[PDB]
Ligand binder design. Structure first.
Ligand SMILES: C/C=C1/[C@@H](O[C@@H]2O[C@H](CO)[C@@H](O)[C@H](O)[C@H]2O)N2[C@H]3C[C@@]45c6ccccc6N[C@@H]4[C@@H]2C[C@@H]1[C@@H]3[C@H]5OC(C)=O
Ligand SMILES: C/C=C1/[C@@H](O[C@@H]2O[C@H](CO)[C@@H](O)[C@H](O)[C@H]2O)N2[C@H]3C[C@@]45c6ccccc6N[C@@H]4[C@@H]2C[C@@H]1[C@@H]3[C@H]5OC(C)=O
Ligand SMILES: C/C=C1/[C@@H](O[C@@H]2O[C@H](CO)[C@@H](O)[C@H](O)[C@H]2O)N2[C@H]3C[C@@]45c6ccccc6N[C@@H]4[C@@H]2C[C@@H]1[C@@H]3[C@H]5OC(C)=O
Ligand SMILES: [Cl-]
Ligand SMILES: [Cl-]
Ligand SMILES: [Cl-]
Lengths: 471, 471, 471
């Protein structure tokens, strides 16, 4: 009943604790070991103006060469599991089979997986984290085109065949919302489209449409071809953010909030639930929103063994007043009620600390979509920016410590409220590359010294997690 | 006066003898050492139907790993010089600087060059042999676009900076005719365009236009920035084929032949000579043929320290009767006069043995364009196809031996006729990848055993060259 | 008579062209191969707020590991010489001998030296570039104490003994002025005092007194114990800036200008010329200025075989209105003569381009001090800050190119004017750590890519120096 005392014994024996990362944010080795370029290589190299400080992830924090050390950090940490993604163009440098299979890349992921297991850490592997192979992008528009479904399936298949004997927990995509929206609506993330040159009214909906089909075809492939031999499970992971009615009463705000949810989580959750987009979306986007063949619907319906959700912050929503995903939602976001922000800021101004959000979003998801099995796949906060601190100052991440305590507590509540959560993954393991943000933002429970070969050192949060949750 | 007795002492002391190869036909290592894909990787991988036997050059004859052996073969051979090209996307895997500089690729060419020199073999290095980096191709149409001129100059510059201290003889392009015509007119060679989807009426002329400008900008860059410090020379190399009037008399055939020349050699030779295309071409292509700014003309005019010519065969020409380079020439080719072929066939049916052609084409070039310094940069013939021979049978390449004797003799004549030829390079050093032909065609003075790790063994021609020309 | 046309052939054949670095700005491996810490390690680690970005030289541009590449670059560059310094605490981790002699550090410098010589590049070696061993700083305050003279001698003897057989050009100190002024008057550089806590009125005078004694004691040691067997030369390297009277007419301004030169350059040049400090400094500093015993003056007088000057920029000077070196000078610095800036800005607002300054500083030194033999040991300029350019754009360094042209031109002038100038070193070879300014300011003629392992690429200036000055 007091969050600072929360610990492993407040959870069922089989509950899974872990941490995570994605390939491009940590691996480096961009051009080592036969890896091909991804759209994020091109984006950061051709448009350095789009990145704080003009940096990229050629080297990142060099987990590609330092992975034996990360594994050792994970062993000392004590948690059950580690979540990471595979770099598509490291194993298939030309994206599709005819561009060559990269043995060295396969060999890297085998080494990582063997190391995790030799140490009793269970791997959760995500197939895709926005790093589309540049060659598929240049050949046919990547996820714009539906050719991407077949290529994606060849890739998924390669992975199950090589790693499936050991990896028993797969996810097809992570955060597809973010890919679709900032890739094609705002143009702020690779491939940087839409303000032809792009179109925020249309492309985001095709891209999301192709994402979902790719997800579904891969899940079917796994279920029909691998599941019986390998006995693992497959799932997917979604961006979420709690939507709160600016005015508790105005049932017009209650609507705005519920619409904001549809356009973020329903956009992906409805189709794998009933095989169709949500009415709210069909209503306000109308004919710009693609439809599913009925065999497509039949294939998307129930396409998952579990769902993971990533949660960070929350917002107030109210109603609003050529075409564009953003304007299509017809909402405005507010941060305060009468001068009071929904929660304090972290180091980042888009991130307001609101622990109750995670309990809500979890309950809302079980209620609205009826998922039988959930993982919190990402959750965390960033240090305040300050290049002026020596290590012993830098590593005292009180705010992060409290932020994890509070959110893990709320996860525990949601379980009492009947939501079946099988685990929680803190984000992230290492300070790393943060996309448009470059290296200026630190999300890690492990500190990275950029001045001295990416030296790893544990923050207080890390030690707290090991002590409270070791096993 | 008898070709079988020809030897080194029939030539001036400073005359250069050598052999040659191009990167994609011999290196293999397609995806080793950080190399990026070129349009020839994509072509052979995505359209295996365009290649005899569906093969490609991933491994080729693996000079990339076996180069110490090739060097040893070259030392035993005894000739002065070795000509080879650099694979653009081995040193710049993304084509342009922002895609990364590949140290390992640079390191390979340094090793090759140091080895040649440690053995007293002079290297002649060609910058470009049709292997356009796929990334420039996908980003802006490669040589279709004029963006290719700047990228090409960055590439040229990289090479001069890294290798220019040792490499004193450069050529910008080899056989640009073949690239332009079969790349964009017939669609038989990468990138496989033109029967949008291509256009044999227009693209070949833009591509040739961009080739020439790339050539000129690089030569200027070398002359103004490197030549004084490094003291080497730069040049270029052209496809040629002797054109003969079907009827010695019909001054209408005399015209057809001269027009056939313009459209093959004049197309490239006129612009670096006077800074403009030949009238014949301007007449029959008219407004589909691009023009040169006058500063462009001024830059192309005299853009070379020497010219090399590649010669293989000859043809009879007579006059002929939507748009297309082929039909634009208004000629027909014939192989016989009254049932008599212009010369016997080799293993290939497009190759008719006509030694006098090389004397003619050489004299014609000095006469018509006034080149002060010429190298024969390619010349050779192929074995008859026969998988039925054991090595000791296979290596007896009489036809090649005689073919080299006869052509080297005619080169010697042309020199008496006042043409200033400084050297001759037999083609090629190794049996290797022959483009649309795959591995079924053998042009080497060194035999390659495809069944046993690409084992090198000298044919009789090789031993003949060593004995007749050693020094 | 045009700077842009200046080239090697405008200079005597024995004239020497090169480039330069100092150990802490490029080495890294700060705790590799046995190296102990200098006052710069401690300063950047304990007071990161004093460095832009809070960065440090732990890895810098990693010449400790990449020196073979650096040597290859120096080779391709084709200049005669390379100026670098030795890290005192890398060969003696504890500063004094009883602290241990580090074989592995010694072995690094030998490998550097041999690699230079194998490529025909002559090494010019500076013993001290501000990196005082932290052990000596802590034991007795480093250059505050006269104990530093003995230790510095032991350090110099070691280098003479180990490297003297191959190194024929030595310098004891580089820019002692900067060390004394910003270490002890402003407190902006290590060890950061003056801004007990330090005394800007007394320490800089003591530090400077000890720097001069250490310089003389080491020169004496070289001359009496090594010069005969090793046959090399030894001098020292001073910071200069051209001081121009705000009002050409005001004889009061002419004096401010002469006094500014006194307090900057005469401070160090007079003692080695006549064995005492300049009259104006005695006058304005008075009893706070230490005295030389008569036998120290005998040791200082004429204690050099040559002198190097570092030139960057210029200023206008006028008169001024507890104690501080800064106020002692009693002058005021002006940049504008009526909104007419003495010269345009480079990337740094302290640096105003004024090529004639170098001519005057040179002539002024020959006349005022009578130096027989002079090298320009440093001269160069920084790129405009810009993390938005891709590499093809970044490497286009016209301003640095013109800056070198004009300054080199002016060096030629000074030689017509009678100044015996034996060589000129461009500063610097590489973008590298720039003290208080961190990695934000680029001075190299070789670009460094901080995002991808400090990948090296030549800027236009580098290509230009190779071409114009190769030999
Ligand atoms: C719902 C979770 C998210 C998180 O997404 C996470 O961010 C982490 C920290 O960077 C990364 O480590 C992870 O890779 C990622 O999962 N971040 C934050 C900050 C975002 C942002 C702001 C402005 C422009 C683009 C942006 N994409 C960022 C992504 C998507 C989303 C928000 C998004 O919120 C907004 C304002 O839309
Ligand atoms: C003037 C010299 C040439 C030679 O070009 C050489 O061929 C050698 C052997 O393969 C290679 O080793 C070399 O890389 C190349 O320089 N070959 C031959 C056979 C060609 C051919 C025929 C049919 C389709 C495409 C083709 N391109 C082939 C190229 C260009 C040209 C002819 C060309 O003649 C014709 C009919 O146009
Ligand atoms: C006379 C030559 C110099 C140059 O010194 C050079 O700078 C290069 C580029 O950074 C370095 O790579 C070289 O190692 C260094 O010798 N820089 C400049 C800019 C300085 C500066 C300004 C503010 C605080 C400390 C400072 N020390 C810097 C040093 C000493 C001096 C000036 C100095 O200008 C002033 C106001 O005195
Ligand atoms: Cl395929
Ligand atoms: Cl670029
Ligand atoms: Cl001692």
């Amino acid at each position: 009943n007091d969050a600072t005392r929360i610990s492993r014994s407040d959870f069922p024996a089989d509950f899974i604790m872990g941490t995570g990362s994605s390939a491009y944010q940590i691996e480096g080795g961009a051009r080592d070991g036969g890896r091909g370029p991804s759209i994020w290589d091109t984006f950061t190299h051709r448009r350095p103006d789009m990145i704080r400080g003009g940096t990229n992830g050629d080297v990142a924090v060099d987990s590609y060469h330092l992975y034996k050390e990360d594994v050792n950090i994970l062993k000392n940490l004590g948690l059950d599991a580690y979540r990471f993604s595979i770099s598509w163009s490291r194993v298939l440098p030309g994206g599709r089979l005819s561009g060559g299979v990269n043995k060295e890349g396969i060999n890297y992921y085998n080494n990582l997986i063997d190391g995790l297991l030799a140490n009793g850490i269970k791997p959760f592997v995500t197939l895709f984290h926005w790093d589309v192979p540049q060659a598929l992008e240049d050949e046919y528009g990547g996820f714009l085109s539906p050719r991407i479904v077949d290529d994606f399936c060849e890739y998924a298949e390669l992975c199950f065949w090589e790693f499936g004997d050991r990896v028993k927990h797969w996810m097809t995509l992570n955060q597809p919302w973010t890919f679709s929206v900032h890739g094609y609506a705002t143009g702020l993330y690779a491939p940087g489209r839409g303000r032809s040159t792009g179109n925020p009214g249309t492309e985001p909906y095709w891209v999301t449409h192709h994402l979902l089909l790719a997800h579904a075809a891969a899940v079917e492939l796994y279920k029909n071809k691998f599941q019986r031999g390998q006995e693992g499970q497959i799932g997917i992971s979604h961006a979420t953010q709690w939507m709160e009615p600016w005015d508790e009463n105005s049932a017009s705000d209650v609507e705005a909030a519920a619409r904001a949810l549809d356009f973020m989580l329903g956009w992906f959750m409805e189709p794998i639930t009933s095989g169709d987009y949500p009415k709210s979306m069909k209503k306000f986007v109308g004919s710009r929103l693609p439809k599913f063949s009925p065999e497509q619907s039949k294939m998307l319906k129930g396409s998952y063994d579990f769902v993971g959700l990533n949660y960070y912050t929350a917002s107030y929503v109210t109603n609003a007043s050529n075409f564009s995903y953003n304007t299509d939602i017809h909402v405005t976001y507010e941060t305060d009620r009468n001068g009071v922000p929904i929660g304090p800021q972290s180091g980042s101004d888009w991130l307001l600390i609101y622990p109750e959000g995670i309990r809500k979003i979890l309950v809302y998801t079980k209620k609205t979509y009826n998922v039988p099995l959930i993982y919190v796949t990402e959750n965390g906060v960033d240090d305040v920016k300050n290049t002026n601190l020596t290590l012993s100052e830098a590593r005292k991440d009180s705010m992060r410590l409290k932020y994890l305590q509070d959110h893990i507590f709320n996860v525990r509540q949601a379980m009492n409220d009947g939501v079946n959560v099988k685990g929680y993954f803190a984000w992230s393991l290492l300070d790393n590359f943060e996309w448009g943000e470059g290296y200026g933002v630190r999300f890690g429970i492990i500190h990275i010294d950029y001045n001295d070969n990416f030296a790893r050192y544990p923050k207080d949060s890390a030690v707290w997690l090991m002590n409270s949750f070791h096993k």
